[PDB]
């Protein structure tokens, strides 16, 4: 029945994950008690993809993970806190101290088996498991360190299941600690090996969008998260609602990932949130760099593949025409050796508070700008071995950092190979 199993690790992961379930629970007519109260059977046609059916109640197939209880205690008392299965809250007490080694090797190792037990119980009750999705940040310790540990354990036990991630990349503009480039560099290599899709959500881009476009003088993490939950809703629209597409995770990945390591996507959304947008405006916005959440200029690279889903009632002859006009405008920014690498899909159901919207999924080589940014911040500290004691104190060796640095530089050069090809 094409089930998906959702995991959210750490502070960031649980806070964007909670908002994701709030958004789609509303789209599917599920209330904070898990009871259906919608006006269309389309809301329920693919409800099983993300929800288990209990007293006619729908329970998210979601596992909430953290190494400290704070953020999950806040989720349990949040708006939709009661719909999550209580047994799927798996948390420790010591915290991860924004330390990848604590999440990946010490504190996280003590908790990981417990998480996998819940993952197994959820996977066992799946008629046909599509795969997994993980929400997390790469700049902390739990989501980054333990999240990538979980991904490695899940691939060992489920090697033939898709693993996709929504990964929040750190930025000095929106930063908690200076060690974030260390944690992100260590995590990226894990994702290079063990995920089929990784949506690169850059906090720098989310901030710039909140400040310059949405005119929010002082964005909060909550403001950044409204952009993420909205993007996640769109990216999963074709899996959750009937329409043109009925592809599972594997088929979606096959047509988007031409090379196994270049699976890091630049997501986008339009309209950025009374005048309903025209189709030309939706199309022009979702290709504008200002609507992209990776803080990479697509004009500095080339698209390997592009997928875009349009939601709402609209003329699709008009969308096809506009997609042609924007491709002509950006003709030199698409590789010429993957024919017909720009695909479009439709869903009649729009998201809440919008008559129509569009979600952009780009597999662009410009994403190398993000990895180069992280690599430069990494090296700035690693030249002087600054703040390394937090990691060597947990058993890590200098060599592991040198290898992560080289792996990052190899990833960047592989993108530059296909940007010139």
């Amino acid at each position: 029945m094409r089930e998906i199993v959702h995991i959210q690790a750490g502070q960031c992961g649980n806070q964007i994950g909670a908002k994701f379930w709030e958004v789609i629970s509303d789209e599917h007519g599920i209330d904070p008690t898990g009871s259906y109260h919608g006006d269309s059977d389309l809301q329920l046609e693919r409800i099983n993809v993300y929800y288990n059916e209990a007293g006619n109640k729908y329970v998210p197939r979601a596992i909430l993970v953290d190494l400290e209880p704070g953020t999950m205690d806040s989720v349990r008392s949040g708006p939709f806190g009661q719909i999550f299965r209580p047994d799927n809250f798996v948390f420790g007490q010591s915290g991860a101290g924004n330390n990848w080694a604590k999440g990946h090797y010490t504190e996280g190792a003590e908790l990981v088996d417990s998480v996998l037990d819940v993952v197994r119980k959820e996977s066992e009750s799946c008629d046909c498991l599509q795969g997994f999705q993980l929400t997390h940040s790469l700049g902390g310790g739990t989501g980054s360190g333990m999240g990538t540990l979980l991904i490695s354990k899940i691939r060992e036990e489920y090697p033939d299941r898709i693993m996709n991630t929504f990964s929040v990349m750190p930025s000095p503009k929106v930063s908690d600690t200076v060690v974030e480039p260390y944690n992100a560099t260590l995590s990226v290599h894990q994702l290079v090996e063990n995920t089929d899709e990784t949506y690169c959500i850059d906090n720098e881009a989310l901030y710039d969008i909140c400040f310059r476009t949405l005119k929010l003088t002082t964005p909060t993490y909550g403001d950044l998260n409204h952009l993420v939950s909205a993007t996640m809703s769109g990216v999963t629209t074709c899996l959750r609602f009937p329409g043109q597409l009925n592809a599972d995770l594997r088929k979606l990945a096959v047509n988007m990932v031409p090379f196994p390591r270049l699976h890091f996507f630049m997501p986008g959304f339009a309209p950025l949130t009374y005048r309903a947008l025209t189709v030309p405006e939706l199309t022009q916005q979702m290709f504008d760099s200002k609507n992209m959440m990776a803080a990479c200029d697509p004009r500095h690279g080339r698209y390997l593949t592009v997928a875009a889903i349009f939601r709402g009632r609209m003329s699709m002859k008009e969308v096809d025409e506009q997609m042609l006009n924007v491709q002509n405008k950006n003709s030199s920014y698409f590789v010429e050796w993957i024919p017909n690498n720009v695909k479009t899909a439709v869903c009649d159901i729009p998201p809440r508070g919008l008559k129509m919207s569009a979600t952009f999924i780009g597999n662009s080589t410009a994403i190398q700008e993000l990895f180069k940014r992280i690599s430069e911040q990494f090296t700035a500290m690693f030249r002087r071995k600054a703040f390394l004691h937090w990691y060597t104190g947990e058993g890590m060796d200098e060599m592991e950092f040198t290898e992560a640095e080289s792996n990052m530089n190899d990833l960047v050069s592989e993108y530059q190979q296909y940007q010139d090809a």
Binding site: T106, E394, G395
Partner: protein, 59 residues
């Protein structure tokens, strides 16, 4: 994780030993300092016996 356990245990071990050696070295030094002081005072007591003996002879 084994390396982390080994480093913490080795730090605990070397501190326990470094302290045990400092506290014993200090005990010996203080005991020697006080022993030398008294030995000088006993030497004076002996010198006082010689003085009182030297008086008796003159009588």
């Amino acid at each position: 994780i084994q390396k982390a356990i080994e480093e913490n245990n080795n730090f605990i071990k070397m501190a326990k030993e470094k302290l045990a050696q400092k506290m014993e070295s200090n005990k010996e030094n203080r005991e020697a300092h006080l022993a030398a002081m008294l030995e000088r005072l006993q030497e004076k007591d002996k010198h006082a016996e010689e003085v009182r003996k030297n008086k008796e002879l003159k009588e």
